[PDB]
Design a protein around this nucleic acid. Structure first.
Lengths: 257, 217, 266, 205, 276
DNA sequence: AAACTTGATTAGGGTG
DNA sequence: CACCGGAGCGGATCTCGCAGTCGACCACCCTAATCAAGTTT
């Protein structure tokens, strides 16, 4: 606590997160954290959206994760098609997109952009972005962004450094919910996808097996093959085709096939 | 699966410790110096390296029922079941296993210098080369079994809903009283799966002898 | 499971990873088991996130490679010069792209440059410069750069921008390339981050420990305040605790229980 | 899916393991994608194994190491003689389904009826100075942490084959990596995936 | 004051005070000012354990005992936990064998189901413990330097000795006077509704009759889902389990999660329809 | 004739 | 805009030690050093 608490007071002047985020980082008192943010003058799935925005005549490409709220961004020389093509080549390098939102701007609505979304298999969507759910997140992202650069950038010789810092503040350092940053929610969703897929893969097989039954303990001859409908502990399910009635069958009394 | 049974067998005055999986029918065998518990502890350490046994059968023999053998089965986290061997389900398999085993030993031992080479040969014929059904080997059936024993299978089953239901059972067709409510342990076609809480046994109940229970609404 | 997982360790002596995944206890507990096990510490340190860097020249293009040691997940980006400051910009970006627990590298200038190590301190990352000695590491790093130049040589004809081609190789190796059950380094990585994070969530959310001093009565005469040690099982007015001296559980009268917050000096 | 895997390969040039695992195509077919891609055969850095004998405290141990899964086998050895090794690869060709082998030129392996046992059993046996950083790092470290975990386990156990088995248990079975992948996980997967194509492969041969 | 704190901290490290005076004089929020002495070594050390504790009402026929040295007379005292009807008897020695016989007697007077008793060797003795076990009874251990777990028997040692001091001249026998005290407080002491403990024990023996409990099985069970609201939004029915008993506006239920009995207000209940 | 186990009678540790 | 939740502080509830240095001699139960009594290779 009281060793953490000063150090977080040191660190917020650097990284300027929520009082929430430091409460949830360092395990401090939240209300003291709030006292810092007030007493800090400075603060005083795989579906995305892109926007350009200008900060001190520095064009910036802004990716925003429509669910986790995670963001990528980078400084940009121009709003050209080609520059953004290499930007989102790198972005698709660092990220594994399904899908995207954006406006109708030329670099997006430029063809080889979209052809590269096809070469990469992303479903590109341009149109007047209409959605309060999205566009409010867009809005606060920009306002709080340039707020946050305007916090950080004088600390930094290079602007790309400071920008990376803003990304770190939001993606990494800032928390939401239970202490869950955007990247937390993000990575969770990522790993959840693949295990959804693996699960389906194990759902694909549908195995069948031989079986037999006892009479006064004395065995029946092998029966089936018939599908393995549900496995239990030490036994399975099978449809008896003779009676059209399912059977609980001991695994030792089975030959899986 | 991974339910194995042992019987020492003598082939040509060579003790052969014959592992028999009750389900795939997969086996292991090795020439053995004696029926000693200690040697058996060594063999089952080796073999618990070669496989992942959950459980075991054998007769009541001295090596098996031995104290530090039992403590070894515990130490390795295997369930050892010792008994008068009384089952034709597993003992048909074990009987034919030893018969075909000595048969193939008598086939292969002329073909090889070492009897461990030839016994290894028998395990090759029977586990690898021997095939059935669509042409899967008993070793393939074991690999197969082990491969679908995965926990990532368990994750998906956790993700699903379970629905609950009452259930009854018939005597001479006379419907018994309803029972439960219980888990739909698996949804079937015309029936499902349910355990009897009373007898602690999985059971099937035709959907007419079921009443499914609606969700919290 | 943590005592039982430790029991499995002192028996078998597994990896921290293997005990963790096996018994599902937090992985730093499994690490601590290996570390509190003399047997594995006698005979052999890296957590999950540990990176190693080497600059690499390809076609007179300086590239700042990162290589995660465990997952084998990698980043790299083309570079103008090997300088301290440019490298500082790159690793700022990278640390926005990456949460890395620790670094290794050699003694090259930007690494050994002063404000860069100060920036590891600003960023709080463990930096280790020195002759990288580890066969675990150096085989991975070496094959990583060989395979890097290999795949650069494959892909760069297919792309206008050498940078988008480099992004291409990172896609191939971190995403598309797989091993075992279909594991890319990215998916391994994301998983490891996930379970690690969730180790934090587990440990933070669940246990509110308490600790205490304690004492005991001899002809009624109370002991001195002792240990202190941990609340095992709480009950109203008395608890369970272990005697460190006898390694044995004990029930102590609250009156003779001097309560402590858990973290102690830590 | 093999078609889209070669379009994806000509694009991105994956491993046949990665196209196999990505598209669920048989690994043979994925190997045919890569080995037919000139990008990949211009640019180059299953059930395949290596052996080397080793002595651990005056006890020879015949050390089998699978080059892909990292999955290991061992048994105590009376001597490095060839006939013993022939018996060990009969037993071991029983306990596994080896496709191919690497090893040094040592007496047992290069021995004539050993080679003819590799032909009889039909394993591809490459005798020579092992040159590959791929295998030799893994095999070296295998002897390192093997003799380690022997040094860990052997006090616990009466027999040395019991503790030896102990090490094999820890590394084959208890040890894991990746997502909780032991070597034996890797192998059992690769074989059970070999089964289903294998029901096709009798038609493909 | 947020940055007054390290100095205030020092002033605890120096002058070691309460979270309050420190809180106020340094004018901070107090709560981390408590986290000071949480994090102090010094002031953390020497504070006392404020701890209320509890005694067990426990079980019907659950019991508690200690021997007595009244006027140099060992008197071993047989004292219930729940409704606290008692017994005692004068003894010549405290010994485990003697003790074992005494409890045979008293046990035979009742169906006492369990016990709390201290570290006295006769309570503790091997065959004593085996005798509880032999009879299927729960001894529990009064613990070191807690007569307080042994509460009631010491309490009653008070009460009794007062009554002794009355009665003993009235008798030939000290132990007939012992009978007199025994009589009185197991009977003649009557209160609340004007009832002895004897009333309550015996009543409850009627109350605890097994046949009646077994018989109520015929009465219907329903199960019920309970569920929980996070930011207002109730969970799934958790699970579904029997309405152990219903009240008005709520019920009796168990969380298998705790394996412990519980309430749900009847709004957060799902009533689960019958078989039919 | 050394060692090897078991029963008997007084000295210390937890409880009234 | 109404309803529920995290953080905060005044007030309310429960247990206990300051009474000089504390032991001296009992009774019961459990454990242990030491001496005496047999055989056995």
């Amino acid at each position: 606590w009281i060793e953490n608490i000063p150090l977080a007071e040191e660190e917020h002047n650097k990284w300027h997160q929520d009082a929430v985020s430091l409460h949830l980082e360092f395990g401090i008192p939240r209300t003291a954290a709030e006292d810092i943010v007030q007493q800090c003058d400075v603060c005083q799935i795989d579906h995305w959206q892109v926007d350009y925005t200008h900060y001190e005549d520095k064009i910036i490409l802004v990716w925003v994760e429509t669910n986790s709220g995670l963001i990528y961004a980078e400084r940009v020389k121009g709003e050209t098609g080609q520059e953004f093509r290499v930007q989102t080549m790198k972005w698709y390098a660092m990220f594994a997109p399904k899908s995207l939102q954006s406006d109708n701007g030329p670099a997006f609505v430029a063809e080889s952009t979209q052809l590269l979304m096809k070469y990469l298999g992303i479903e590109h969507t341009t149109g007047i972005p209409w959605n309060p759910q999205s566009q409010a997140l867009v809005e606060r992202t920009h306002q709080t962004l340039k707020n946050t650069l305007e916090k950080l950038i004088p600390m930094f010789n290079a602007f790309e450094s400071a920008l990376a810092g803003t990304l770190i503040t939001l993606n990494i350092k800032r928390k939401g919910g239970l202490g869950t940053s955007p990247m937390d929610i993000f990575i969770f969703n990522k790993e959840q996808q693949r295990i959804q897929q693996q699960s389906k893969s194990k759902q694909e097989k549908i195995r069948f097996c031989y079986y037999r039954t006892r009479k006064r303990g004395h065995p029946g001859e092998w029966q089936g093959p018939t599908q393995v409908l549900w496995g239990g502990d030490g036994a399975i399910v099978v449809k008896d085709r003779g009676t059209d009635r399912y059977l609980v069958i001991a695994n030792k009394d089975v030959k899986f096939i």
